[PDB]
Amino acid sequence: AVAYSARPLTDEELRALSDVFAQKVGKQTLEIENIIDPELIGGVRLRIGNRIYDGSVSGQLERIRRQLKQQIENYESQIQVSDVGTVIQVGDGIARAHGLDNVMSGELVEFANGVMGMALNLEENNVGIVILGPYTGIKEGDEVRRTGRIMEVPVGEALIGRVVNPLGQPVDGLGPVETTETRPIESPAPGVMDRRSVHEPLQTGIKAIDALVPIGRGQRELIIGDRQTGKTSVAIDTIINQKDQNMISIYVAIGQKESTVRTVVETLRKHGALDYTIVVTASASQPAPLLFLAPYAGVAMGEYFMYKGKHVLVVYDDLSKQAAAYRELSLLLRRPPGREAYPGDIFYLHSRLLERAAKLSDAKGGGSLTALPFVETQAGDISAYIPTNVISITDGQIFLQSAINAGLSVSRVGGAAQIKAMKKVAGTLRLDLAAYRELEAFAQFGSDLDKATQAKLARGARTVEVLKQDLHQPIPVEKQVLIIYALTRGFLDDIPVEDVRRFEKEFYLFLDQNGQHLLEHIRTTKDLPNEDDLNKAIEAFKKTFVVS
Amino acid sequence: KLAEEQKEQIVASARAEAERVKETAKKEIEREKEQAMAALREQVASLSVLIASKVIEKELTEQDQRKLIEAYIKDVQEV
Amino acid sequence: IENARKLAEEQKEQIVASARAEAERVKETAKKEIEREKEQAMAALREQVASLSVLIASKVIXXXXXXXXXXXXXXXXX
Amino acid sequence: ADARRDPIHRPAPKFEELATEVEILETGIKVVDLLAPYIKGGKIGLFGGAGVGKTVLIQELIHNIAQEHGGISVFAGVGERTREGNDLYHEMKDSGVISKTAMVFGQMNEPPGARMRVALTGLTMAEYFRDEQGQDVLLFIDNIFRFTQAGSEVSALLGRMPSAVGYQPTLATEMGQLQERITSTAKGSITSIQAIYVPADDYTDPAPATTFSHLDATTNLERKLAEMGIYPAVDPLASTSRALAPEIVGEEHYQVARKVQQTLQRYKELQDIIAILGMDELSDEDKLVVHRARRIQFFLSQNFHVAEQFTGQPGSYVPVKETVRGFKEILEGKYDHLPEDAFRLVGRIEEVVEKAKAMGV
Amino acid sequence: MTRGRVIQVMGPVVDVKFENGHLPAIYNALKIQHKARNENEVDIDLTLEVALHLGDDTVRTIAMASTDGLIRGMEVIDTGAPISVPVGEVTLGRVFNVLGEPIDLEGDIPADARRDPIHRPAPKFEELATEVEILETGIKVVDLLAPYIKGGKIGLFGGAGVGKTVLIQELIHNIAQEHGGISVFAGVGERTREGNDLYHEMKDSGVISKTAMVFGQMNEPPGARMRVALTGLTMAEYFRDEQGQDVLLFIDNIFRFTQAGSEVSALLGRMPSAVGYQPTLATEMGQLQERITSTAKGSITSIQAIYVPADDYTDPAPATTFSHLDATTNLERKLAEMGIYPAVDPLASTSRALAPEIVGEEHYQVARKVQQTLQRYKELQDIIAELSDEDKLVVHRARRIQFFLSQNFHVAEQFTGQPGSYVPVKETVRGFKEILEGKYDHLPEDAFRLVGRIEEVVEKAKAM
Ligand SMILES: Nc1ncnc2c1ncn2[C@@H]1O[C@H](COP(=O)(O)OP(=O)(O)O)[C@@H](O)[C@H]1O
Ligand SMILES: [Mg+2]
Ligand SMILES: [Mg+2]
């Protein structure tokens, strides 16, 4: 009960104010200890308990707050009130404060410096705060005030084509982001009676994935491999290929290098993929609290579009760095570690996040959200703790070898998420790939009957040469299915294996020239065209081909 | 034939890249203008704050004491 | 074929360089114009800011007070 | 609001009420019928790692059994994928097993407190039928490991000193308090089939090791067998049943199963020396052992009804006597000339003969 | 006023009590300077770094030197800023410690110089370079098979007796002579004998006029060896930002940095992570390595020596440091035993810049062809020690290719006599392409030894 005033107030006025506040608060009597602080010349600033009622000098600073007629003639000044606390501990990124009586769990608090934090534990006379930012400006004795909102991020269409951090603050320097809505970071998943089976294909543009491990809209597929196997390239090619499809892509980078993020954004801008992409970033030099909220910010941004009937795709560039950041944060709070020093709820941390991807029913609107988590292994060990934690959450996996490993890469939902034209030709290709894969195991040095000597080796070698691809050059599904159909039907068997790539390039050129009816029939029907016409076109191309 | 088509494709891609660069430069100029206007507004606001503070200091506080008491009573009633 | 591709690439690179240089020249002209406009608007909107400051102080709380405030603002600027 | 309601927590049945007897339940799976048959009133467990085939086996068993049971069934899903429950609900609604089934769902996205106390709700629902109408009840549990995992997550914040590997001090007590209410008393019976998860493919973890002691028949799935394409991936030597006795299943069945296990163990002993030296440094009897063991290991696989959408084959069902006959013929060297690949993914041995015939031999 | 007082002393860890609302910020520097009042005391000159705010006006700090002789109640001064080291042209040719005081007995830096704080946030997203460039070292094998990238990270897997301190001097010399850059060498956990040897080597070969040196010794408290790399980093950042040069930074062992961090974390009472490391291993590594970038002004390129514990490449420390590296370079003994200098392994060395979209298409193809030929020659060793038709030609070309990778350096001149050369990337690519085509198949194999461009081998053959 202390007042700051420009001049020493009359004792009668002090008594009247004290009685008024005693009646208002709920106390029989109240006494005010007025001060002689001269800086506040505008009026009186009261501090009772942990509540503050401002004076008039702050209004001038509030004038700067009202930077925004002529400001409605400086608009109007009102007695703003706030609930406050004081810091009693700070170190390693976790604070601890007194006060903050009526604070909620998960709320957002603001330090006097300008940084934000989460209210984590509400103890009997304490609040545990996690600092989302630089903690070297916070010292014991500082003041922290409430915001009255659970954690949330800004959402909208103004975020498209921008680079932001997990709190929605732009980092590309193009100016403020003008959104008008928010969504909580922690939100429930769709229920059992809100979903439906996946029945639409998501085209990556890569032949090996589109033919062997198909992905549907609303699925959760995992991409797993060692470092230096190039999964960022797969993500970038998949994002680039969605130019024509009505899809919104979101790219989340966790624990990466900011230079590589810069070059990835430059690659995206070249191919015109920033008209439908949002980038959320938290580099390796940022605090662990920020490295751990980024996937949740990304999914919160995606669900805004998903719950309107639109289709979204979200990429988490590394979940194995989110896990390490969470382990670091939880070990600083002195929680008993489990296997590999990971906490007990490291499975919950990922299962609560990947269960927000769904294919909604037609009563809910019909939207979707696809997810592509990344996990990085050590020496190709797929039976570690985190890899097995995430393998048991998703609907398949794609194992990259230090080149997809078809012995461990599978897709459950896919198969019904494929077009009929590719479903007709994928089976033969799978059998040929298996035939070569097992044959080469023993036939490295050994004579075989002509069957296993040619049909089991040359066909596999040709298909392995066909499955290769180049960077940032995705392929349409019609061309994909046509080349796979030719290979499975039997052409290329008299073409040298050193010329298949040029054969395919020239075949695409011939198609784009004089195969308009074939391509349009495929694009319109989602079924193979007439076999006689296809064979005639392939024979014409083979006749015009100059075999080397 | 195919070589000339590839040359035309390269020319078209270069033209698209140049147009994107031109649009980026125009957007940069617009952003610079917006930032300059914002900075001018900020300087005007700071000068207004300083001059208003000086004027309010020069103003008589004899009635301002009663005004502050009345405003405090009103805020007590409101809260 | 290779010679034609190289010629097309060289012409495309020359066109890109010319477009970038023209954009840089336009940027220099725009920067000069924006600086001149910033200075002129600084003077004009500084007079306007003094007037609006007198108005804001009056609103928070005639000609003679405005003149005194203008003199004080000039002294502060000096 | 006026319907009768029962509390979730109650003590277990006493010693003077249980009933002990062994009858055999038929599933139509060769590796299960032969080497580890199921009991008609006990507890059955399916251990597995991540992505090895617990869910497919659960769905196949549901499809085969729940209709033949003709009684009541309860399905409780704790800590599993929500899309799996959505698929299962519609599959049951299409097949018609609903109107004699009750379902309870607490899944991956729920807080630990909900995942802890969901198995108890299905348990109460089944106990009502058993102890009030004298019926025979089936009980399926989607993953019983999540119950102890959620308990471990809670115990840390409750303020307890951690046990080995970070688990809770009260793992065995909670597991026993849950698992001792699933019994068959003098009134009715409760046949419970449970799927158990193995973290990091470690079978010596505290939770699988503790749960191993409550089971009458167990089924262990291994990733190495699944990597070779063998499906289901049941390990034929580490899966056990208390009903594999000469007086319960018969005398021919017992001898056939024992001989098959013996040949598989002998083949397992010779893996390292084959790996380093090769097959050329073995005696004739050892080569014969390998020749029959590869055929047996491939003939333990099968094609399932619920796996048709993956591969294409319609699916198969084999009674016990046919399985015993087929393995007896295999052990006798009757089919030693056919290629080893003709034995994969077939129902019976006549299908093996047909597949070899269509292969050009 | 703003005076603290010592409360507790437990080895290298100290606690200081301050006044209300006057505590120093985290990472600040505090000074103790005491003169013996009586015969029962000693003189103290100590520096401490703030680590935690424990509450009740108490701050827990780590010490940069020995704490023997501290008495509870001695005054402590709060400087108001982190450790500040001198920067500019005054640091070229001198040797410093973690506090920025010279240790070469050549005088003191004047008190009116400019000093910069040790702790700083990384450069922002909008200030980085949008493209990828290539650093031309001038060494044939490095420039052809494992190219360097401006603003990149390189791991040197060398050792003792393979010629590492000669390669470092050659890099310093070449960069300074051709590009105009400056070099900084930071030795973390350095033996004093080896530091003395390196200093005398650099003074002999003359490069000392272009490089700054910082030493954090093996006999220093864990706090000192944890913050040595930051002093070299902030010495290089001045030349990067203020001038706009392309700067080189050498780190003598990045493993001792993590070990010192783990020791400090254990001293402060923290729960250890997997394999007993600090919980904040990745955060500390990232805070060090994210300041080594290429901005729009200049660039810092870092070469770091890495030791792999227990020969385990999946250990947490090498696994954490390998996710920042852009290239590697391995030195091997037997390549030195054949008289090949530098003894860089041409097949173990890798780089992510060897892609057709960065180095073009001719460079890429020539590099791959050289690698395949060398791999085949390596395969044929068992047979060799008339086998086939093309294998003789393969061996004939491969001997010349393997010998042409050697070079004469400007720092080996003082021992050999030859002037030493600097070979551009276009010239080395053209020479290797011509050798591959066979245009120089009619010369003795010894002519291809310790020369520069492809004309010098022809001249050597002509004169021999
Ligand atoms: N009986 C089976 N036949 C064929 N494939 C199977 C069988 N069981 C599992 N699979 C393979 O395993 C994958 C599904 O594994 P799943 O059972 O979901 O793992 P989990 O053990 O986590 O339930 C499918 O893609 C399928 O290819
Ligand atoms: Mg990655
Ligand atoms: Mg399961």
Residue numbers in the entry:
A (entry chain J): 6 to 73, 91 to 424, 434 to 579
B (entry chain L): 85 to 163
C (entry chain C): 80 to 140, 600 to 616
D (entry chain E): 111 to 471
E (entry chain D): 1 to 385, 391 to 469
Sentences reproduced from the published study:
FoF1-ATP synthase (FoF1) is a ubiquitous enzyme found in the membranes of mitochondria, chloroplasts and bacteria. It synthesizes ATP from ADP and inorganic phosphate (Pi) coupled with proton translocation across membranes along the proton motive force (pmf). Therefore, we designed the δΔN-α fusion construct of Bacillus PS3 FoF1, where the C-terminus of the δ subunit was genetically fused to the N-terminus of the α subunit.
As designed, the three binding sites were almost identical, with structures similar to those found in wild type Bacillus PS3 FoF125 and other ATP synthases. Structural analysis using cryo-EM revealed that the δΔN-α fusion and the b2 dimer adopted the canonical binding structure observed in the wild-type FoF1, except for the missing N-terminal domain of the δ subunit. This observation clearly shows that the N-terminal domain of the δ subunit determines the number of peripheral stalks per FoF1, restricting it to one by disrupting the structural symmetry. The F1 structure was found to be very similar to that of the Bacillus PS3 FoF1-εΔC under uni-site catalysis conditions, with one β subunit bound to ADP in a closed conformation (βTPC) and two β subunits without bound nucleotide adopting open conformations (βEO, βDPO). The purified δΔN-α fused FoF1 was prepared in nucleotide-free conditions. Notably, at a low-density threshold, weak map density was observed at the outer periphery of βTPC, which can be well fitted with the open β conformation of the nucleotide-depleted F1 in the Bacillus PS3 FoF1-εΔC26.
